Write an enzyme that holds these catalytic residues in place. Structure first.
Site, short mmCIF file in Angstrom:
data_model
loop_
_atom_site.label_atom_id
_atom_site.label_comp_id
_atom_site.label_asym_id
_atom_site.label_seq_id
_atom_site.Cartn_x
_atom_site.Cartn_y
_atom_site.Cartn_z
N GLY A 1 0.81 -1.21 0.00
CA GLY A 1 0.00 0.00 0.00
C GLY A 1 0.85 1.26 0.00
O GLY A 1 0.59 2.21 -0.75
N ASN B 1 -7.62 6.27 3.56
CA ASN B 1 -6.47 5.40 3.82
C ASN B 1 -6.04 4.84 2.47
O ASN B 1 -6.46 3.76 2.06
CB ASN B 1 -6.84 4.30 4.80
N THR B 2 -5.19 5.59 1.77
CA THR B 2 -4.85 5.26 0.39
C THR B 2 -4.05 3.97 0.28
O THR B 2 -4.04 3.35 -0.79
CB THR B 2 -4.07 6.41 -0.23
N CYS B 3 -3.37 3.55 1.35
CA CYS B 3 -2.60 2.31 1.30
C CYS B 3 -3.49 1.09 1.13
O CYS B 3 -2.99 0.02 0.78
CB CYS B 3 -1.75 2.17 2.57
N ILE B 4 -4.80 1.22 1.37
CA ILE B 4 -5.73 0.12 1.19
C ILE B 4 -6.86 0.56 0.26
O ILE B 4 -7.90 -0.12 0.16
CB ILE B 4 -6.28 -0.38 2.54
#
Lengths: 807, 319, 60
Positions: free
Chosen positions: A478, A774-777
């Protein structure tokens, strides 16, 4: 029984290989007998005789196929009495009865067509072996029947005599289908889409069945006399499965015949030739200097127009018995016309060796080449290539595969990436800041330490790429996703760089990339051409390669010619439209000026010379297109040299060293062979994704989570609000939204591009707080706003506030 | 009374009177002099070519009149002998007289039969703008001709004119008279072309009706008018009707003989003529697509092996 | 039995077709189904009707 392997294998199981060996040893007779077998196989289908049967699966292993045959060959004679489907385009969806064990006729017809195609391919192969027969006998089989040139001639004649009946039948059907499809297209464009009977507008049991049948009869009666000008022809392609199988086989025969036959300042100079993706099937291109750029290359007008499922016709501009068009829709008329043309045409080895055998398809028409047919039945082919791709297109030697869009090429590419990824157990780890300057320096230094401590002449195959941010200790893929975009945006910024010489321990501060012409799309900026800058560029290429291997997007919006360099292929005049559309059109006008009677006066009056002024983003100053170019005037006769060198210079020479470095960087990670199947459009979709944020594409992959506890109907109303707002966003705003949600402005080019799928979580009502992601997910959080207006304002502010909070 | 106004067909029950006479300045309250109306009709038909022109919806006068006559037949059969206008007056017969008279003009009939042809191009609501299309589409779309209005007119003439036969006899007599016009050059071939186009329309009507209506196992001479009139047409135009029917038979068999025919779901044959006719209404009540706007008994054991049997979804065999 | 029965029937049908082409079918029943012949049966009645009408014209 034996299933054809989609992977090309030379297994050729003995049960079939020995049959082929028999035919090869007895070729001159085996061909005739196989023709008779093919006749017996086709007649049940062609005449509507074949029995209905239930479906069955093809056997994957040779063992199960052999066992199935045992039940068929373990038979005793009777003793005597004792002594006492991809979705169709809207303009053609009307032609398909689909949503896009019991026996059935169509099942049997299709399976019989499969058997027929098998026999036809065997016949084509046997005919293909004739020229080499005098060599392939002694090197393969201890003994075989001798045959001569005269016998090869007679074999060709015999085979075609047995195949012509089926050919005429097939052609009648195909011509009617193509006529109906082209008619539907013309009617759809000419008519009013607002009308309920319009094909694009459309795109009880007993009475519906009766109505459909009667309408079918009505359409048939009308089409017979060309009395069908104001209604769509009644047509269903799902019924054409068996003819599709037969059609592939028959093209295979003719294509094999053609294979046997084959086995400057001019516009003819390779630079001006239309390139990959641009050359339509058996169509003759419209001259690029006669058609304005806006019309010649719609994709060049709208560089974001490319879609994974875009029609080639839209992107690159809409375009003898076969030269006569398939205009009739009535079947009967088509068969009669075929027969009329056909009747006009119809009414030791002695001398030459077999190696001099010159077979061809010279009947039905004087000369046939498959491109002509792919052009004739172009629409029927395009529709089949989506409806039958999983069935007919899965056959060996499939001709539908030539109609494969982005997804097909992407499937092969992904297989290659999986093969490469799984060969190494050593990962890549990057620890970087979010600040642009620190980000660039840190990323490049660590990439050099990773690359140089591994063999620099071998591709950097790795299993996973993991990234962590300083003071923001997220980990894994992510973060790598957010990092690819952060570093890409750092590259594309117009702000000045930190000193890139810091990267060598592992001032030319000119931005790495610039926007040529009037596009928001980039070309590498050469700066001062120092080694530090080229080092950075090579590492950028490595980033691109790594992202491809990891199935992640790298949103560096490069121009088409840059991509061609990365792919290892030549750049052409047509690619200059993607560098600078304005200059493309102006140079085109210069070429048109060279054809005027005053061309000499025009070129002299313009004071043109083989030297060009460069803007600051191109390094500035004046650079010669050719040595001594300052003193070399442009003339109507060398105008093509001037335009060619102008385009080549700005696309390649200005940034030749940056481009060379980036090319090596891509090759530093991925093998060149994996790029051979890709065009610039495919590389763009794999690396850059969809530049145009197709909202429906984003919707179909999105899942919604609820933290508010509210009822489903209220949540549905809110979801609709969100998507409506998104649809009304400008392209810049849509890209900002996707960037906010996933840390990447581009959408993946396919469902398989998302890992995991994107989602939106609806939080309890709050009209003060902004959305967070939550850009990592790939998870966006949106408060359950009391009004659509609040959602719009808050969402726009959140996405445009690139100073994202540390959620 | 409401010409040019926003008017829409209402979906309530049809059992109602007309409010126009009370709520508005109704201009249709006065019948006028019927004899003068008819005399003027004849004079206009012979004095002008207006009979050949379509209305603002592209409808030829004959189509207008045939639908009007059938409709009046329905409305006028409900009439009964006995500031407010005079009521209980005798209904008009002008539409029927006009239909009978117009059908006697070879020009009106030719224009209607040839209506939708490449020559008789309908200017309105009938793909009349083609020049803006690229050549491929022009070539394909200019090749076909329309028959929707000819089919609807023929359908009305046969199926809806259930209280008349003189209209069909007039049409057929005109076709025969011109087909026998051997003494007029060019006119003979024109009469034949017109007759053939008409026959193809009739054959379409005939096939649809005959397929829908179930054959009676009891031998009956009912021969419903929808089919009997088709047979009458063929009999009057036999030498040409035979050839056209052969071509129809060809188009019907080819889909089966070549393995082309579409799969379809099964349906029951209609026992009554009424339900067959109604089913055809859904097929003939069609408007042309407008142009883009400007902007089993058991087998014997020796043969049972030959039968896969025990002795909605579409299927090929059904079709 | 479903899948294997379908496969066996189809393969036996192909076998019978290939044998019948050269009159090499002396010891096995031909593979045949009449339920598929409904459409040809309709056509057959019509064609006999044509010829029968011709004979009636000759006798009339």
């Amino acid at each position: 029984e034996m299933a054809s392997s989609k992977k090309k294998n030379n297994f050729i199981p003995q049960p079939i290989g020995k049959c082929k060996r028999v035919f090869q040893a007895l070729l001159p007779y085996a061909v005739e007998e196989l023709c008779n077998v093919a006749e017996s196989l086709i007649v049940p289908v062609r005449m509507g005789i074949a029995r209905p049967t239930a479906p069955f699966t093809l056997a994957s292993t040779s063992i199960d196929a052999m066992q199935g045959s045992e039940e068929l060959f373990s038979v005793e004679p009777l003793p005597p009495r004792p002594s006492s489907a991809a979705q169709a385009p809207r303009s053609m969806q009307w032609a398909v009865r689909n949503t896009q064990n019991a026996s059935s006729y169509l099942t049997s017809a299709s399976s019989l067509a499969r058997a027929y195609s098998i026999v036809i391919r065997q016949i084509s192969d046997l005919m293909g072996l004739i020229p080499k027969y005098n060599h392939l006998v002694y090197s393969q089989i201890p003994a075989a029947v001798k045959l001569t040139y005269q016998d090869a001639v007679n074999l060709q004649n015999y085979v075609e005599e047995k195949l012509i009946p089926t050919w005429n039948w097939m052609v009648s059907i195909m011509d009617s289908t193509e006529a109906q499809l082209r008619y539907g297209s013309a009617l759809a464009s000419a008519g009013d889409p607002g009308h309920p009977n319009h094909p694009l507008h459309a795109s009880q049991g007993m009475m519906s069945a009766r109505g459909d049948f009667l309408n079918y009869a009505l359409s048939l009666m009308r089409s017979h006399n060309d009395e069908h000008s104001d209604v769509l022809p009644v047509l269903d392609v799902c019924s054409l499965k068996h003819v599709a199988y037969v059609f592939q086989a028959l093209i295979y025969w003719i294509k094999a015949m053609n294979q046997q036959t084959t086995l400057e300042t001019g516009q003819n100079h390779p630079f001006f030739r239309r390139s990959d993706s641009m050359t339509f099937l058996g169509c003759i291109p419209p001259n690029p200097f006669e058609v304005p750029l806006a019309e010649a290359i719609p994709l060049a007008d709208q560089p974001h127009l490319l879609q994974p499922n875009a029609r080639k016709e839209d992107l690159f501009g809409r375009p003898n018995c076969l030269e006569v068009l398939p205009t009739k829709m009535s079947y009967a008329a088509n068969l009669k016309n075929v027969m009329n043309m056909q009747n006009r045409q119809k009414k030791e080895s002695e001398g030459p060796p077999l190696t001099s055998f010159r077979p061809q398809c010279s009947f039905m028409g004087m000369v046939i080449s498959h491109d002509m047919l792919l052009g004739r039945w172009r629409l029927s082919l395009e529709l089949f290539g989506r409806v039958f791709m999983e069935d007919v297109g899965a056959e060996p030697g499939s001709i539908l595969t030539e109609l494969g869009g982005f997804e097909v090429k992407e499937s092969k590419f992904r297989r290659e990436m999986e093969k490469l990824r799984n060969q190494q157990s050593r990962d890549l780890s990057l620890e970087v800041d979010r600040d642009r300057d620190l980000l660039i320096q840190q990323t490049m230094r660590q990439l050099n330490n990773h690359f140089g401590r591994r063999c620099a002449t071998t591709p950097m195959a790795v299993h996973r790429v993991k990234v962590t941010f300083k003071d923001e200790p997220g980990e894994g893929s992510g973060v790598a996703r957010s990092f690819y975009t952060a570093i890409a945006q750092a590259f594309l910024s117009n702000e000045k760089l930190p000193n890139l010489e810091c990267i060598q321990n592992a001032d030319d501060n000119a931005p790495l990339f610039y926007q040529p012409g009037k596009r928001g799309f980039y070309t590498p900026r050469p700066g001062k051409n120092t080694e530090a800058r080229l080092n950075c560029f090579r590492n950028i290429g490595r980033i691109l390669g790594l992202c491809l291997l990891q199935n992640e997007l790298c949103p560096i919006t490069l121009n088409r010619h840059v991509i061609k360099v990365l792919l290892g292929r030549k750049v052409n005049w047509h690619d200059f439209a993607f560098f600078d559309p304005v200059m493309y059109e102006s140079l085109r006008q210069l070429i048109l000026a060279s054809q005027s009677s005053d061309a000499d006066a025009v070129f002299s009056a313009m004071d043109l010379a083989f030297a060009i002024d460069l803007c600051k983003e191109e390094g500035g100053g004046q650079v010669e297109l050719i040595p001594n170019g300052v003193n070399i005037p442009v003339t109507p006769q060398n105008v093509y040299e001037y335009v060619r060198k102008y385009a080549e210079h700005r696309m390649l020479v200005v940034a030749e060293q940056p481009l060379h470095a980036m090319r090596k960087g891509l090759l530093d990670v991925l093998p060149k062979n994996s790029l051979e199947d890709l065009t610039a459009e495919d590389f763009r979709l794999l690396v850059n994704g969809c530049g145009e944020v197709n909202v429906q594409m984003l919707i179909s992959f999105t899942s919604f989570n609820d933290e508010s506890g509210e009822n489903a109907e209220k949540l549905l109303q809110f979801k609709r609000w969100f998507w409506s707002i998104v649809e009304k966003m400008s392209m810049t705003e849509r890209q900002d939204l996707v960037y906010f949600w996933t840390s990447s402005p581009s959408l993946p080019a396919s469902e398989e591009g998302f890992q995991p799928m994107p989602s939106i979580t609806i939080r309890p009502p709050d009209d003060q707080h902004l959305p967070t992601a939550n850009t990592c997910i790939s998870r966006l959080y949106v408060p359950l706003y009391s009004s659509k207006q609040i959602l719009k304002q808050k969402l726009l502010l959140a996405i445009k506030t690139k100073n994202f909070g540390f959620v | 009374c409401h010409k040019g106004h926003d008017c829409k067909l209402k979906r309530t029950s049809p059992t109602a009177y007309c409010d126009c006479w009370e709520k508005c300045k109704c201009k249709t309250l006065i019948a006028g002099q019927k004899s003068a109306r008819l005399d003027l009709l004849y004079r206009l038909l012979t004095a002008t070519n207006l009979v050949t022109l379509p209305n603002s919806r592209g409808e030829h006068l004959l189509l207008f009149l045939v639908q009007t006559v059938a409709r009046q037949t329905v409305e006028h059969c409900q009439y009964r002998p006995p500031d407010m206008p005079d009521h209980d007056l005798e209904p008009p017969r002008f539409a029927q007289l006009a239909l009978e008279r117009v059908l006697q003009d070879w020009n009106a009939l030719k224009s209607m039969i040839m209506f939708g042809s490449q020559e008789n191009k309908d200017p309105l609501s009938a793909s009349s703008r083609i020049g803006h299309l690229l050549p491929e589409e022009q070539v394909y779309l200019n090749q076909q001709s329309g028959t929707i209005r000819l089919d609807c007119f023929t359908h009305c003439l046969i199926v809806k004119c259930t209280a008349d036969i003189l209209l069909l006899d007039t049409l057929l007599g005109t076709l025969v008279k011109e087909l026998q016009n051997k003494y007029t050059p060019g006119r003979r071939e024109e009469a034949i072309a017109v007759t053939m186009r008409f026959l193809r329309s009739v054959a379409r009507v005939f096939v649809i009706l005959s397929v829908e209506m179930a054959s009676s196992k009891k031998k009956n001479n009912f021969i419903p008018q929808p089919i009997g009139k088709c047979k009458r047409v063929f009999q009057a135009l036999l030498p040409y009707a035979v050839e056209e029917l052969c071509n129809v038979a060809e188009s019907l068999i080819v889909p089966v003989r070549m393995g082309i025919a579409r799969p379809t779901a099964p349906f029951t044959l209609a026992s009554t003529s009424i339900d067959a006719m109604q089913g055809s209404e859904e097929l003939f009540s069609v408007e042309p697509l407008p142009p883009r706007p400007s902007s089993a008994a058991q087998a014997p054991r020796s043969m049972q092996w030959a039968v896969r049997n025990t002795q909605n979804a579409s299927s090929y065999l059904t079709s």
